[PDB]
Amino acid sequence: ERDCRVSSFRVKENFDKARFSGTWYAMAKKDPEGLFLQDNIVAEFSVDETGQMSATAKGRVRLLNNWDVCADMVGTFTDTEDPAKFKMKYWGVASFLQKGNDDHWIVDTDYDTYAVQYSCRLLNLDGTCADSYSFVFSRDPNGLPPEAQKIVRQRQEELCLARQYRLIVHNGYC
Ligand SMILES: CCCCCCCCCCCC(=O)O
Ligand SMILES: [Cl-]
Ligand SMILES: [Cl-]
Description:
Blueprint: H1 17-20, E1 22-30, E2 37-47, E3 53-63, E4 67-79, E5 85-92, E6 100-109, E7 114-123, E8 129-138, H2 146-158, E9 166-167
Antiparallel strand pairs: 1-2, 1-8, 1-9, 2-3, 3-4, 4-5, 5-6, 6-7, 7-8
The site of one chloride ion has 2 residues, from loops.
Protein name: Retinol-binding protein 4
InterPro entries: Calycin (IPR012674), Lipocalin_ApoD (IPR022271), Lipocalin_CS (IPR022272), Lipocln_cytosolic_FA-bd_dom (IPR000566), Retinol-bd/Purpurin (IPR002449)
Family: Belongs to the calycin superfamily. Lipocalin family.
């Protein structure tokens, strides 16, 4: 019944980069193929005078053969015609960390409590996403209040992802 075409997904009306700046703690993640950020994931958003949004992120990543390292990542956001949809160029402060360019959508936020982010890296031929990821962010590292949690669950369902998240732990690893 429900529409899972990426082209159908609503995103945050009149998204305000300035209001979104500051520290966001990842509470939950839906992983893409070949997942990178594992847990202890914290993002820092900024906007400069030209209106350009950028971010840094810290988190544990586990490169294969199970060697744990705290990745330090950088992202810069190129605007699109939709104020809530961006292209995010990202890299690690270390050369060998994963680099790339992903769609970065702010699906919903109230700026001071919760955010829902979404990226489809690759479409299916029917317009659904073949390879997606999504972060749920909280301003408070101890988690969302119930009213926000309930809104977020609705958005997770609208993205056709609600069954597919895992919780992100924060235990000072970094
Ligand atoms: C919120 C901006 C984060 C900086 C870009 C790093 C994001 C790349 C990792 C996301 C995909 C994954 O973690 O599997
Ligand atoms: Cl609930
Ligand atoms: Cl579920």
